[PDB]
C-alpha cells in the first residue's frame, strides 16, 4: 500500500482488530466483571456471597 | 461547505421528476450522501443513501423500486429520479451530507449527518392549477374595540401554493398579518390576511389589498370599506 | 424499527431535562445513535453522534447516553433558544435508517395570554357568488393548546369547517384560523352563528347574525 | 484440570533428617491448566565455588 496523507478515505490506513471466543473444555478463563450491590444487616434477606 | 437543491414543482400522480443537489467546499470521494424527506408539519423520514466511492445504495422500504439515485463527482452533484409518484409524497426533500462514507451497514459506530441543504418542496395532485377568488372582509363594530378596528382580505380556492397579498402596494406594515393558508377537502388552498387600524380611520385612508398569484399571472387590488 | 420516543417534554428554564428513545436490537443493539435538533423552519442540526460526541459548535450543555437498548439526550439547563424538535436516529440491520418521532420543548415561560378572537361573516360579493364562508381568527394566546367549536343558532356543527394548526408570530405567541363553508340559503336559514374557542379550560366565544 | 499445591514451612532443630510430629498443610495455589501429568523431577543448585 502507498499510504499518502493526501489521500481520500478509501486508500487511508485503517487498523483492524478481530476478536473470537471459544468454549472447548477448559476449567476457567476470562469472564466478565460481575456486579456487586451492598450488604445490609439485621434483616431477613436473600443473599449471594 | 454549502448544499443547494433544485427540481421540485407540481406533477399529477403517475408522472416523474428529477431532483438535483449541488455541493461546494469539499470533495465527494470522502462523504456519503442522503436524501431525506419530510412531510409538512410531521417528522422526518429517511429515503435513500449512496455511499462515497462509487455505488452501494439503499432505499427505504415504502419507496423500493420506484426511485433511483446517483452521484456525479465530475460535476459535484446528486440526482434522485422519481418515477410513478403517489399522493403521499408531498414533502420537503433535504440533501444531507454523511461524514465518513461507506453505507452505515459497514462503517458502523460513526456516521452522523453534519451539513444539510435548504430543501425543495414537491407536491402531487390532479387538482391542477387555479386562480384565487378574493373578498374584502369589512371593518365592523363586531371587529371594532375602543381605539382600533380590523379589516382584511380573504383569498380562497387556489392550488398553486405560493400566493401573496400585500396591503396598499406594501405600505402598511403595522398590524398586517397574513395567516397560514388552509388546505380544504376540495384540494384547494385558502387564506385570509387582516390588519388593524385606528377606529377613527375606518374608511378615511386607503386600504387596498394587492393579490398576486405568481404561478399564474393574477394581480387584483381590492378595497376594504366598512359595512354598508 | 419504530424507535418509540415521547411526543413532547417540558420543564422550567434552568434545570436538567432528559429525552429518551427506546429501540430494540438492530436499532440500538448493534449500532450507534445520533441526535438532531430542528428549530422551527430551518434545516436540522446535528447534536450528538456516536452516542456521546458533540461536534464543533455544539455547546457544553448537551450530553448523551446509550444503555443497552435505550438512549438519552440530557439537556443541562434550558434556555430561550432551545424550543425545538429533537430526533434520535439509528441504523437497524433491517437495512433501513430509522428516525425518531420527535419531541417538542415547552420552556413554559411566557405568562398566560388571552386568545383574542375575531369573527367575520361572508361578504356581500361572496353572497352573490352563490357561496358563503365564516371566518374565525384567533391571535395572541401564548400557550398554544387552543381548540374551536362552531355553532348554528343553538346547536353545534361539525361539517364544512377547517382549522389551522397554531403558528408562532414574531412576539413568540401563536395565531390560528378556521373557516366555515355554507351555502347562502343555509346562511340565511339560521338566524345567527358563532365561533367559540377553548384554551386552558377558559373559553371565549364570538357571534354574528346575518344582517 | 486444576493443579493444587499445599505447603507448610516448619523450622526443624536438626539440619537434614525427617522429624516426628503433627503439622497440617495450608493451600497455596490453584492453576486451571488442563495439563496431563505422569512424571516429575527436582532441581538443585550445583557446587561451583
Ligand atoms: C490424558 O491422557 C489420557 C490417556 O489415557 C487421555 O485419554 C486424556 O485425554 C488426556 N487428558 C486430556 C485432558 O486430554
Alpha helices in chain C (DSSP H): 124-128, 184-189
Q: Which domains does chain B have, with CATH numbers?
A: 2-124 (2.60.40.10), 133-223 (2.60.40.10)
Which chain A residue's Cα is nearest to D1?
A27
Of all protein residues, the one whose alpha carbon is nearest to atom 4 of ligand 1 is: D36
Please give the grid coordinates belonging to residue C116: 383574542
Measured over the CA atoms of residue C5, residue C7, residue C10 and residue C15, the dihedral's sign is: positive
Which residues does a 6 A CB cutoff place in the pocket of ligand 1? D 34, 36
Bridge partners of B3, per DSSP, are B23
Q: Choose the residue to mutate in D3, D34, D36, D37 for probing ligand 1, maximizing ligand atoms within 8 Å of C-beta.
A: D36
Name the architecture of domain C116-208. Answer: Sandwich (2.60)
Helix (H) or strand (E) holding B144: none
CB C63 within 8 A of CB C130: no
Please give the grid coordinates belonging to residue C18: 432528559
Q: In this complex, which of C50, C99, C124 lies closest to B109 when CB atoms are compared?
A: C50
- The set of residues, in sequence order, having a beta carbon less than 8 Å from that of C70 and lying 6+ positions away, is C20, C21, C22, C23, C28
DSSP state of D37: -
Residue in the block written with cell 338566524 = C191
| B60-96: b (≥16 Cβ within 10 Å) or e | beebeeebebebeeeeebbebebeebeeebbbbbbbb
Taking CB atoms and an 8 Å limit, are C55 and B58 in contact across chains? no
Other CB atoms within 10 A of residue B213 CB: 20
From the CA of D34, give the closest atom in ligand 1.
13
Taking CB atoms and an 8 Å limit, are C123 and B119 in contact across chains? no
Instruction: Using a CB–CB cutoff of 8 Å, tell me whether B73 touches chain A.
Output: no
Other CB atoms within 10 A of residue B186 CB: 11
DSSP state of A3: -
Bridge partners of B22, per DSSP, are B4, B77
Residue in the block written with cell 380590523 = B150
Q: In this complex, which of B104, B116, B184 lies closest to C97 when CB atoms are compared?
A: B104
**B106: Cα within 13 Å, side-chain hemisphere:** 11
Measured over the CA atoms of residue C69, residue C75, residue C80 and residue C82, the dihedral's sign is: negative
Going from the Cα of D34 to the center of ligand 1, the distance in angstroms, rounded, reads 10
User: Resolution in angstroms for this experimental structure?
Assistant: 3.0
How far apart are alpha carbons C44 and C40 in whole angstroms? 9
Helix (H) or strand (E) holding B121: strand B120-124
Q: What residues of chain A lie within 8 A of the CB of B30, using their CB?
A: 8-10
Helix (H) or strand (E) holding C126: helix C124-128
**Which residue of D3, D32, D36 to mutate against A (max A Cβ within 10 Å)?**
D32
Instruction: Using a CB–CB cutoff of 8 Å, tell me whether B29 touches chain A.
Output: yes
From the CA of A25, give the closest atom in ligand 1.
13
Query: What is the count of residue pairs from A and D with beta carbons less than 8 Å apart?
Result: 11
Taking CB atoms and an 8 Å limit, are D34 and A29 in contact across chains? no
Of all protein residues, the one whose alpha carbon is nearest to atom 3 of ligand 1 is: D36
Instruction: Using a CB–CB cutoff of 8 Å, tell me whether B49 touches chain C.
Output: yes
Instruction: Using a CB–CB cutoff of 8 Å, tell me whether B225 touches chain C.
Output: no
Amino acid at each position: 500500500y502507498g499510504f499518502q496523507p493526501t489521500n481520500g478515505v478509501g486508500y487511508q490506513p485503517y487498523r483492524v482488530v478481530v476478536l473470537s471466543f471459544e468454549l472447548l473444555h477448559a476449567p476457567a478463563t476470562v469472564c466478565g466483571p460481575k456486579k456487586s450491590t451492598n450488604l445490609v444487616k439485621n434483616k431477613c434477606v436473600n443473599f449471594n456471597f | 461547505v454549502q448544499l443547494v437543491e433544485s427540481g421540485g414543482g407540481v406533477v399529477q400522480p403517475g408522472g416523474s421528476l428529477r431532483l438535483s443537489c449541488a455541493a461546494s467546499g469539499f470533495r465527494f470521494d470522502d462523504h456519503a450522501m442522503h436524501w431525506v424527506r419530510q412531510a409538512p408539519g410531521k417528522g422526518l423520514e429517511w429515503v435513500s443513501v449512496i455511499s462515497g466511492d462509487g455505488g452501494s445504495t439503499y432505499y427505504a422500504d415504502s419507496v423500493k423500486g420506484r426511485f433511483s439515485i446517483s452521484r456525479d463527482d465530475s460535476k459535484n452533484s446528486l440526482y434522485l429520479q422519481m418515477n410513478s409518484l403517489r399522493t403521499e409524497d408531498t414533502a420537503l426533500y433535504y440533501c444531507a451530507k454523511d461524514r465518513s462514507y461507506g453505507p452505515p451497514d459497514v462503517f458502523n459506530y460513526e456516521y452522523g449527518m453534519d451539513v444539510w441543504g435548504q430543501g425543495t418542496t414537491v407536491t402531487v395532485s390532479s387538482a391542477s392549477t387555479k386562480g384565487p377568488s378574493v373578498f374584502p372582509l369589512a371593518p365592523s363594530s363586531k371587529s371594532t374595540s375602543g381605539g382600533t378596528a380590523a379589516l382584511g382580505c380573504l383569498v380562497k380556492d387556489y392550488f398553486p401554493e405560493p400566493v401573496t397579498v400585500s396591503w396598499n402596494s406594501g405600505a402598511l406594515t403595522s398590524g398586517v398579518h397574513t395567516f397560514p393558508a388552509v388546505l380544504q377537502s376540495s384540494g384547494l388552498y385558502s387564506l385570509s390576511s387582516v390588519v388593524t387600524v385606528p377606529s377613527s380611520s375606518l374608511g378615511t385612508q386607503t386600504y387596498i389589498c394587492n393579490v398576486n398569484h405568481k404561478p399564474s399571472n393574477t394581480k387584483v387590488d381590492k378595497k376594504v370599506e366598512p359595512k354598508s | 424499527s419504530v424507535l418509540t420516543q415521547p411526543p413532547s417534554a417540558s420543564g422550567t428554564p434552568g434545570q436538567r431535562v432528559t429525552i429518551s428513545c427506546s429501540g430494540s436490537s438492530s436499532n440500538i443493539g448493534s449500532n450507534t445513535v445520533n441526535w438532531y435538533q430542528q428549530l422551527p423552519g430551518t434545516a436540522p442540526k446535528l447534536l450528538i453522534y456516536s452516542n456521546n460526541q458533540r461536534p464543533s459548535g455544539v455547546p457544553d450543555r448537551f450530553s448523551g447516553s446509550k444503555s443497552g437498548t435505550s438512549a438519552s439526550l440530557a439537556i443541562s439547563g434550558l434556555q430561550s433558544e432551545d424550543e425545538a424538535d429533537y430526533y434520535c436516529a439509528a441504523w437497524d440491520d433491517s437495512l433501513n435508517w430509522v428516525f425518531g418521532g420527535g419531541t417538542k420543548l415547552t420552556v413554559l415561560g411566557q405568562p398566560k395570554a388571552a386568545p383574542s378572537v375575531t369573527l367575520f361573516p361572508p361578504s356581500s360579493e361572496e353572497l352573490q357568488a352563490n357561496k358563503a364562508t365564516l371566518v374565525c381568527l384567533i391571535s395572541d394566546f401564548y400557550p398554544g393548546a387552543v381548540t374551536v367549536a362552531w355553532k348554528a343558532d343553538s346547536s353545534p356543527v361539525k361539517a364544512g369547517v377547517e382549522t389551522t394548526t397554531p403558528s408562532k408570530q414574531s412576539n413568540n405567541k401563536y395565531a390560528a384560523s378556521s373557516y366555515l363553508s355554507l351555502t347562502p340559503e343555509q346562511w340565511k336559514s339560521h338566524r345567527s352563528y358563532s365561533c367559540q374557542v377553548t384554551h386552558e379550560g377558559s373559553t371565549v366565544e364570538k357571534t354574528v347574525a346575518p344582517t | 484440570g486444576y493443579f493444587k499445591i499445599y505447603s507448610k514451612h516448619t523450622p526443624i532443630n536438626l539440619v537434614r533428617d525427617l522429624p516426628q510430629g503433627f503439622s497440617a498443610l495450608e493451600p497455596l495455589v490453584d492453576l486451571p491448566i488442563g495439563i496431563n501429568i505422569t512424571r516429575f523431577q527436582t532441581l538443585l543448585a550445583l557446587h561451583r565455588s
